[PDB]
Design a protein around this ligand. Structure first.
Ligand SMILES: Cc1cc2nc3c(=O)[nH]c(=O)nc-3n(C[C@H](O)[C@H](O)[C@H](O)CO)c2cc1C
Ligand SMILES: Cc1cc2nc3c(=O)[nH]c(=O)nc-3n(C[C@H](O)[C@H](O)[C@H](O)CO)c2cc1C
Ligand SMILES: Cc1cc2nc3c(=O)[nH]c(=O)nc-3n(C[C@H](O)[C@H](O)[C@H](O)CO)c2cc1C
Lengths: 258, 258, 258
């Protein structure tokens, strides 16, 4: 990882270990997307496109030679920077255990919010599609604590129509989960071993499968931390990665508008 | 399988694997009949009758020599054809994962519907009998969510009268299952380890056993896919098999008219 | 090479060998570009982009997170088709040595013309640059048979100014080579072991080096021949590849306008 200029920063290694261990936990908890979607292995730092397979024809018709341009998806790279003071980072070697890191977490939350917004609603500039854009997969639901049990069965019938099988899971808003609270074992038994996930991002529910191979995530470099500069008395660091995301089968996904 | 002219089709083997894997799943999910009935092994492509055992006498009475013709059941063979384009099937070798197969599934559903209609109501031309034709095995049921628990017990008594035993199962319409929804563990305990199956074909319920040997299915050739022709730019394929079905004991079967 | 549907064509292998051997020679003679430029190895049939290294920034300024899209070069794929009769292709097995192939060569010339036009003048849709577009590398020349000897020296001085060294070569129009014909050993000695190449494409001369690494050619699949169809009595075939081209150092190249 030589492109991360790590050996040129005035910090002993213990402070590096502390910073990494503090960031990893918020990434483990705050990324909802990685729980069901699938992940393809790391490639490198310079991989710069992914192939679809199609071809676009630009030539005329009455020609002896014909030609066209292949198509692909270009990755995304991001970078965020923050500042940390040196006296407080140095108080660690004297013995204090609860050192103060109060600007790391603030940006560590914004990174995750941005990524989840991309996965759930998509950005048109890069030409991606979001899970809330396949509109024609809709059913209806109610409000009384019994309507949910009915909607789950009516959805598994449509799954059974096609070839989708395997374990199922439900993804629901947090505030709506209050009304249906009094019974939970019935919901878990109707899913036939399913799991419930509650999130604050979306405003309704949706139902998905978990057999494998329907949603893919392409990573060039995982999230990493590195050095930038030395301002006056406060060191400056950054965090970065490169990624993209594709949805293969629009059939293993049902949106339950309330 | 040389009678399936497979080596004379302009497709590399990867496309064959893709097509087989796409069809197998819909067959695994959409065939309700195969779940409880029993299946006898494959024989061959030219087996053309099955023996009952009876004899029909055609001669007169005052003769020194008497003769008659044996009786049997003749199989059924079916064939369905569809067309697939070549440019889209070729986009697979360039790398695209979500190739388009939108006429395979349409007929793959009609085949299953036809077969289940034969098993459940029978065709008079071939002289078969359907599970909804043994009328004299009837009881009565109600609508309140408690009536089902009563009907199950009243049915197991009549099973206990004869020699039928072993695990039991219930087969029910999908739309009716909505009313009796609030309690499910009681139904499962009264069956003493039974299972519930919901289907959209029939309009009421019925109760069967699962010990083994009461319902048989005779297969000559399992469902298979093969080549027919090359029209202009779109290849053409077909799907086929041969089968028949018999019901031995009309006693391990109870119909609950609502 | 299974994507080239070769085993499904009604031709014995000897005719395949004959056709390949007839095409290879015209490709060996008619491609001027491959003589000095360098070639990078074959990758595959689905490689679909090449990375430059740059990054384009699209976000605003006053944001906590910043993002941008990486850039690349997309390949080119081409396909050309022709028809060959069967009676004449069959006269080969009886013994005739000079069989008639009179539509193969006609398109085999157009393919090469198209490719050389791309290398020498570039196509704006794919965003390439041609050797005749770096205008600011110009000098002047004359007409008398002595002016060429002067221009070569005046060009090698400018090469010596920078780091360019190694063997040199000259590329010249065919019709102009008539005037300077009477002396050739002097030109060859001033190049200090150089070589002269005469072409009918360009309208003037230019001087290049040959040390290695200044001009690159990226190939996905080399030129290949395959089967398409069977019309009535005349089989139909095609020829294809995928490529792109880049110019690294605009300094090892001098254009001598007459
Ligand atoms: C007793 C004492 C200890 C200090 N220790 C540190 C230290 O470990 N790191 C630091 O950046 N500044 C430290 N400072 C402050 C620093 O030496 C001084 O204020 C400079 O002017 C800050 O750039 C210390 C100051 C005092 C009086
Ligand atoms: C660049 C290009 C690539 C093509 N590739 C294919 C192909 O792989 N399979 C195909 O059936 N037709 C292909 N076609 C179309 C086909 O060669 C031509 O339109 C015939 O007339 C179709 O029968 C292609 C056409 C172009 C311009
Ligand atoms: C003696 C004889 C030999 C022939 N041999 C060939 C042959 O090798 N290939 C062919 O395509 N047609 C051949 N033809 C022509 C072909 O059999 C016939 O004209 C069909 O109607 C052409 O499609 C032959 C015709 C004759 C009279």
């Amino acid at each position: 990882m030589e492109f991360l200029k790590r050996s040129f920063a005035p910090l002993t290694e213990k402070q590096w270990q502390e910073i990494d261990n503090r960031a990893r936990e918020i990434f483990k908890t705050q990324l909802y997307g990685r729980k069901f979607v699938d992940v393809e292995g790391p490639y490198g730092w310079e991989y710069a496109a992914h192939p679809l397979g199609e071809v676009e024809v630009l030539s005329d018709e009455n020609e002896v030679v014909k030609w066209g341009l292949r198509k692909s998806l270009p990755l995304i790279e991001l970078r965020a920077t923050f500042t940390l003071d040196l006296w407080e980072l140095d108080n660690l070697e004297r013995g204090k255990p609860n050192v103060d890191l109060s600007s790391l977490e603030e940006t560590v939350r914004k990174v995750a919010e941005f990524e989840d917004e991309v996965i759930f609603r998509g950005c048109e500039k890069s030409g991606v599609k979001g899970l809330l854009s396949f509109e024609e997969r809709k059913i209806e639901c109610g409000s009384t604590p019994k309507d949910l049990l009915e909607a789950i069965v009516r959805a598994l019938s449509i799954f059974s129509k096609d070839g989708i099988e395997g374990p199922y899971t439900l993804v629901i808003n947090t505030d709506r989960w209050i009304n249906f609270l009094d019974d939970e074992k019935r919901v878990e038994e109707c899913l036939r071993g399913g799991k419930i996930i509650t999130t604050p991002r979306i405003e309704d529910a949706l139902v998905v499968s978990e057999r494998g191979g329907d949603f893919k995530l392409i990573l060039g470099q995982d999230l990493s931390i590195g050095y930038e500069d030395r301002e006056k008395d406060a060191v400056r660091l950054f965090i970065t990665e490169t990624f993209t995301f594709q949805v293969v089968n629009p059939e293993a996904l049902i949106l339950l508008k309330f």
